Structure formats: C-alpha cells, structure tokens
Amino acid sequence: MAIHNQKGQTWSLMLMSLIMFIGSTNILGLLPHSFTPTTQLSMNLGMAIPLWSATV
Amino acid sequence: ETFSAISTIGVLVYIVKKYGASIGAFADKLNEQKIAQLEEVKQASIKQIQDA
Amino acid sequence: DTSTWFITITSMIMTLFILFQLKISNYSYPASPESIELKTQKHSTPWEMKWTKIYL
Amino acid sequence: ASVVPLKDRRLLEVKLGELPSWILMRDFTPSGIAGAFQRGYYRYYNKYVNVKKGSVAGLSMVLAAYVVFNYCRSYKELKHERLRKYH
Amino acid sequence: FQFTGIKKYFNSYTLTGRMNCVLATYGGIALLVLYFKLRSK
C-alpha cells in the first residue's frame, strides 16, 4: 500500500489474494506425496499475461 | 523414495516447540484487541455523561 | 514431465479467483476502528456549540 | 448430497477447532475455549502439547488426511512389490 | 451469490484485467504447433 499512494490503491486489494494462493500452493507440496499446480508451466502463462497486460 | 517424508514431518515437530509461544502472540493479539474496546467504551461513556 | 498441450489447468485457475476474493474480502482492519472515535467527539462538541449558541 | 458433505465440515470444525463467536453462539464460542483438543490429543503420543491457542490437532488431521488421500494415486506407479511381503 | 459480493470489483478492474484474449490467442496458437508435429510425427 505504502509505495503506490494514489487512486491506484483500488488495485491493491486483489494483489493480496495473489500472494495467498501461490503462497499456499507452493507450501502444500513439501508434504510426502502431494502435487503443486504451480509446477506445470501452463497456468503461470495464464497468471502473467492477464495481469501484465492489465498494466499497460 | 520417501525418507523425505519423515524430514518434512520432523521439521514440523520443531515448530510445535515455538507453538507454545505462539499462544501468547495469538493470545496477545486477542488481549491487545480487547484493550481497545475497553478504552473506547470508557472514553465514550465519560463524554456522553458530562455533556448532559 | 515436459508436459504438453496446455488445454488443462488455466481454465481452472480463474474459478479459484472467485473463491479468494470471497474469503479475504470479509476481513477487518484495526485502523478503521480508530477513525469512528474521532467523528463522535466533534459532533457532540458542535452540539455543545449548538447548546452554547442556545445560550449565546 | 450437497447438504451431506457440507454438514461434514461444519461438524469437523465446530468440535475440534475452533468454534467461533457471534452471540447466538457466545457460549458456543467458549465451548471451544476448553476445546475438544483434549479429545484430539491422545492419538500421537503426548508430544504435540502446544495446541492450546495455536491448535495442532485441529489442523494436523486435515493434512494427515490429504497425505493418505494422495498415497492412493501414487500406488499404481510405484508398485515394486515382489511375490511376498516386506520385513 | 458468488457475483454480487464482488460485482462492484469486476467492472472496476476487468476493463483492463479481463484481457485473457491475448492469453487465448497465445494459447490457441500454442495448440496448433503441437497437433502439427504429431501429424508429421
């Protein structure tokens, strides 16, 4: 929140949902036989491009 | 090949040690949260009575 | 492994961002609670000023 | 069958972690203050004793369920078993 | 009711955020080269 300080603060309530999902789905997989969805390269090319081109 | 099953369950035993201090932080958060309302009700009460 | 073909996961990621924007949206900020004590002080002070103008 | 699986989690929450507030549940909230963690305790040996306000046995049962649920899918691939049993 | 809790949020930022068409075009073209290499084996 502190860096932006604009009327671009509306966007920041989403960016803390983005940190809890890949914060969790990278921490679940350390278990014995679990499976991480951020291992496959498919969804990460759907996490970058609909967010990166939402900026330009 | 799951001797790394125990070591991801062994590290989660060492955090149960600090979890007995996490009750204070968790407990501490609740108490800290509790003090604010108590201050607020008292603060609210004095202002209303003296304005009358 | 080098997996392939990608028609999978990425359509099942945006259904997840209907969940995480539902849970995390109902949170509470400690700071908002310090703001409601300020406007209650100025209102009765102006009401006492409305009572002081009822004297003067 | 939706009211069947939804009444499973609302039974495995309000008993063993953590039974919240919002009166009409106020004495139901302190029902978790003693907690059923004393009921959940006896499975390991004694050692996870820190469950008082950071409750281990409330959480560490789901993660023990998600491991043995994922042991079933892996079983077909890593067969390895001879015409016998192990030690 | 998985809509009106977050419907005020959507038409705010999906004006730029809901541009998955570029993901759809870069995805749909990425479908084409893999069916083609298995066609020529």
Next chain:
Amino acid sequence: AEFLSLSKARIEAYEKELEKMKNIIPFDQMTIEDLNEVFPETKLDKKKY
C-alpha cells in the same frame, strides 16, 4: 427560555443515548454488526491507510 425549551429534549436524547450505549457493549465476543454502530464503516475507498 428557548434554551430551557429546545435543549431540554437535547438533554433527554443525550440521556437516552447513555441508555443504549450500555446495551451495545454487552459480551466481549458479542457481534460484528452491533459493534458496527459506534466504530464506522463507509463506501468504497474511504479508509486511505
């Protein structure tokens, strides 16, 4: 006597406000909407910090 006329209801409305203020605090773990009278809420993008 207009102060004795107009502010007399302002005294009793403040006196009745002390009655309902006792009602709201209640149990420690009481409610998430009954505590939403004194401490405020607003429309979109009010709380800056």
